[model samples]
Target: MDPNCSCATDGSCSCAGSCKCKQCKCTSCKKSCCSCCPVGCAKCSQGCICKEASDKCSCCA
Candidate 1:
């Protein structure tokens, strides 16, 4: 998992430390949180799932 992850409004996860995922959940930005896959790719543009978690930081199609 990447140490840091930044989510773009276009549903793209940008890693500041170790970026391994291209696609991520753009749910919302909060304290000590990172981006992750939420419900579906459709709502990915809605917000990002910010939290200290792995797998979600992994890249996908």
Candidate 2:
């Protein structure tokens, strides 16, 4: 997992990291917390691939 993960100011996990599958960087920003984050980074917008996880930062594991 990426160490960049960090909770938000609200004590909630914003977990600003990238998807392990890889994609955000090419379509958007490498600093994105997830693949979906890159959607509106430049032009395109996928909306959000990981909407659930977007609000909170935590793996199913």
Candidate 3:
């Protein structure tokens, strides 16, 4: 989890610290929490799975 961003339900990166991509369902972030991903590579845009748990790549290019 990014120390800067807060774990919010609405996929929003408003943290002041560095942001890193994580898995929501994974033990690190948990299926209920949000995960961080590479810049512009979050699952929110992809339909493969939950935005916080999906492993699919982001559509942001």
Candidate 4:
């Protein structure tokens, strides 16, 4: 991941450029309820929950 995706490690919706795969994983993990929730919930995973829930959720570029 690049600086634009720095949040990729912190689990936040950061889009300076393109979202990293980490964030996309956030979506799939959410399906499993990795304890992830809205923006301010206890993110059990290591990617931004908002980023996953948003329409821009994807790293398949």
* TM-score winner: 1
Tell me the lDDT of candidate 1.
Answer: 0.41
- Give the poorly placed runs of model 4, Cα more than 4 Å off: 1-18, 21-36, 43-61
Which has the better TM-score: candidate 3, or candidate 4? 4
lDDT of 1 at 9: 49
Per-model TM-score versus the true fold: 0.20, 0.16, 0.16, 0.17
Candidate lDDT scores, in order, read: 0.41, 0.36, 0.38, 0.38
Where is the poorest 10-residue window by lDDT in model 4? 27-36
Residue range with the least summed lDDT across 10 consecutive positions in model 2: 21-30
Report the CA-based lDDT of candidate 3 relative to the real structure. Answer: 0.38
**lDDT by residue for model 1 over 3-55, one digit each (tens)?**
33345546454443343434434444322223455435444345553444645
- Residue 9 shift from truth in candidate 2, angstroms: 22
Any idea what lDDT model 2 has? 0.36
Residue by residue across 1-61, what tens digits does model 3's lDDT show? 3443335646554432333433332223422122344433445345334354445435433
Clashing pairs in 2: 16-33, 17-33
Task: Kindly list the per-residue Cα lDDT of model 2 for residues 1-61, writing each as its tens digit.
Answer: 2243222234433333443433322222235434344433432234333544455433321
Question: What's model 3's lDDT at 30?
Answer: 23
TM-score, prediction 4: 0.17
| Candidate 1 collision pairs | 21-59, 26-47, 26-48, 27-47, 27-48, 28-48, 34-51
How far is 11's C-alpha from truth in model 1 (Å)? Answer: 20
